[model samples]
Target: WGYGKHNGPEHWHKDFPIAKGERQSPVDIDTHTAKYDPSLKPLSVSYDQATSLRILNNGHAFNVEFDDSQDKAVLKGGPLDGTYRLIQFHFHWGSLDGQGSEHTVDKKKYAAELHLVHWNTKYGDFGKAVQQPDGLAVLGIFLKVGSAKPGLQKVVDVLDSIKTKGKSADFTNFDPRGLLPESLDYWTYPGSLTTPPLLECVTWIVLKEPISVSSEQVLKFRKLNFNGEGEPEELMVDNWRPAQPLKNRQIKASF
Candidate 1:
């Protein structure tokens, strides 16, 4: 039930732990069959959420934000085979000690990770989509304290507007693409949401390369959030979740 520390994904149950389970997500997905399963459907949406960019300080280690009205670009033929809708994007990062990461390479942990949560329309909303195998797709982008440069100038520029917990900032004419990378080459796998209802049927694609952020950016995320007891404590510096087991799952890498 606890989502951090000793109870984090690294130490969480993947399968038939002491509890019943569906396998966890963000798996290594190492099958490497290299089949042209072009079913991976790209998404289509219109960035028309009356609200453009909305940033929410959910009291987590990182300030989880959402671009509700982002565009619905085109989707070609692939595993998805349908028009999925990009709901919103959020992140999982570690503290100054550098501990969290959703995906691992050679069993290594990155400094931070981002999840762009999306769902196919056949399910209705994110609530129903995450419940089915064909329901959800998450994009994982690794982040760390270095020179990788996340191209997060938009996010950084708006920090002063929502500098503290419980504060949010909204912007019009915002382009979500400002947050994506130059290339889409990535690593693909199958698994469940790291968070609960710990749903299955979720597809995961973790970027082979991670973006770099300055220590200053990392520091801003560590703001002292009001604690669970309604008091202020050193905020969750890094909310990066750890990786889960493969449970015999397979992964594929993009060239």
Candidate 2:
């Protein structure tokens, strides 16, 4: 049973016990008043050939996949082991101003959400390992309406391609990696996937900088395709789950 206005969180939880746990993920931050560790910094990261970026036509959503290869961004030196490989990335946008971002900042809602997922290499390839609790790392970015967002250029170029339900387009020559924020000023903690199985092996890094997507651009995202012919359009503009509890984890910030 899918949870939304129709399925409900706790109702979906009855189907999955982990959903009933106290440490359930996506804890929200005050952003304005949230306490941060202040010691973390954006360490230098890089990627290589083993990485392959993929965009899927899931009909309802454009689920993109990624992994660290010789040609992508990766972590070179820092507190991180660099044992992780890029896995996947996707976005949650809004059909209208009200229904875009799922997470709230300072009790605020943005127009969109994006996720860049990674996984540890210790278990082998990222695709096989990310299913484990200890194997994933993800960075979350919120998209508000604004100017000068660093990565909007990348998606803007593709909007003409993905505008509809169940339509997917893949490009090998275009590296979508440059579409990210400049500041590594982030808030890190532990959490779970925003979606089902809600696996919790993630060491979360949420960037403070939000990329902007105009209302027009958001409309393009709203035009998504669900592969299932009988399934309704996902209209995946705002698929993010609202931020949840951080539990006991201290929110760390690399100021």
Candidate 3:
């Protein structure tokens, strides 16, 4: 159910055998081995500032969901042909600073990983879209420990409001683009969701540039509770799915 020792990723395959599928996520991206694909267009992302609805601590991670009814927030150009609608964005972190990120670069780990989940428009329903082969595209951003990023300040400010499970806050007028790094250079591959259902519908586009997060701020994320108020408060950390088998997949780089 969670990354808890008894119910974590190690035992996930017992319940969801698809966890052992061919195309899995959070692979160790060997930069030197990745081929440069000049044909890969730059990622294009557009979001209406006020589209954000609320931020919820769904127990796994705190997600800032957006109103995707309209075309206000859409992704284009990067390893995708059709427009992909932004559904929500979430983070995966660890108990400490050195090993939180799900996908590593040349075996290098980061403090955290931000997942911007999107669904391809060709498929009407987001749920149905994620059922197909090329239905979803997720933008993976790595978070390093260093300078305090001001853009994330607004997001962190609301973390306290949703410290418990199933808690959420009215988080409007927030723009996620500010959290992005200078360059959009990335590696693309076919993979599955890093969670339970473990659907193999994701086209992963992992950004090479990592945004910075201060030491003090990163620890705040660990303060979140996996359990509710009535239950024993357990810290939510190491929610990442480990690096899986590469199989026959080849990672392409957008240089």
Candidate 4:
């Protein structure tokens, strides 16, 4: 029932009432109105490629999880006051071409968006950290149609093996750092998870620069099925929440 009219973002509030709460995500970034905060330090992201363990089709999106048992993949500085370990990375996109990104800049939607999820050290594991105010940090990277991202193909190539929900494959030594754009400029604000249990514990770092991925690459993601092996097939497309209310939040920029 995920993302369909019966249980889509509009109906999420019935279960997760926080969906209507303050500090929701995917705000339309108005560049001219954002305040440039020089106080925000440059983001420090140190990721050990080997920390990436596997990729799975969680019925929501394809997620590549990392071994956050240690500080092997951690993000520090920027809008954060301490270290946060990378737990997983996932994508949100439209089912067809020319759509699917969650966050927009000046109301311009992209082909897709990449989210690198991290949890603060002091708060312990993702479960506990997910409930704390300053316990999570996410890096949002926009994806547009252009040249294919060679680094991304490594992950794309394995999609067929895990096309069904509950399916996963060993995916190691892949550096997510390679997927990042050239510029580190970003917008920061407090928001919740885009998916279910929309916890309001994330400090969002949405990059200004967008990475390029070819049309063929996006089609590979579409091949993933929302249902398991024996279930009736449902295409996993347009699995993104619509932009939520900005409320009283302030979008701080790092130039």
Candidate 3 yields a Cα-based lDDT of 0.90
The alpha-carbon deviation from the true structure for residue 68 of candidate 4, after best TM-score superposition, in angstroms, is 0.5
Ranked by TM-score, the better of candidates 1 and 3 is: 3
- Once superposed on the true structure, which residue ranges of model 4 sit more than 4 Å away at CA? none
Off by over 4 Å in 3: 48-50
Clashing residue pairs, candidate 3?
none
147 Cα displacement, candidate 2 (Å): 3.5
Root-mean-square deviation of every model? 4.3, 3.3, 1.0, 1.1
**What digit string (tens of lDDT, one per residue) describes model 3 on residues 92-119?**
9888888999999999989999999889
Q: Where does the lowest 10-residue lDDT sum fall in candidate 1? A: 68-77
Clashing pairs in 4: 93-100, 94-100, 95-238
TM-score of 1: 0.76
Q: Model 2 over residues 161-197: C-alpha lDDT tens digits?
A: 7655455666444454565666766776667766767
What lDDT tens digits, residue by residue, belong to model 1 across residues 1-255?
A: 334565544454554252235457554433344333444454233334423446655555334344433335322223455656665666766664356676777666777777777676776676777768877777778777876355575666675565455767675555556555556666666677776456776767666666777777766655535244345454555555455566665565555
Error of 1 at 73 (Å): 4.8
Off by over 4 Å in 1: 1-22, 28-51, 61-78, 148-150, 160-166, 224-230
* Residue lDDT tens for model 4, 135-254: 899999999988999989999899999999999999988898889999988999999899888899999999999999998999888888988989999998998887887899889999
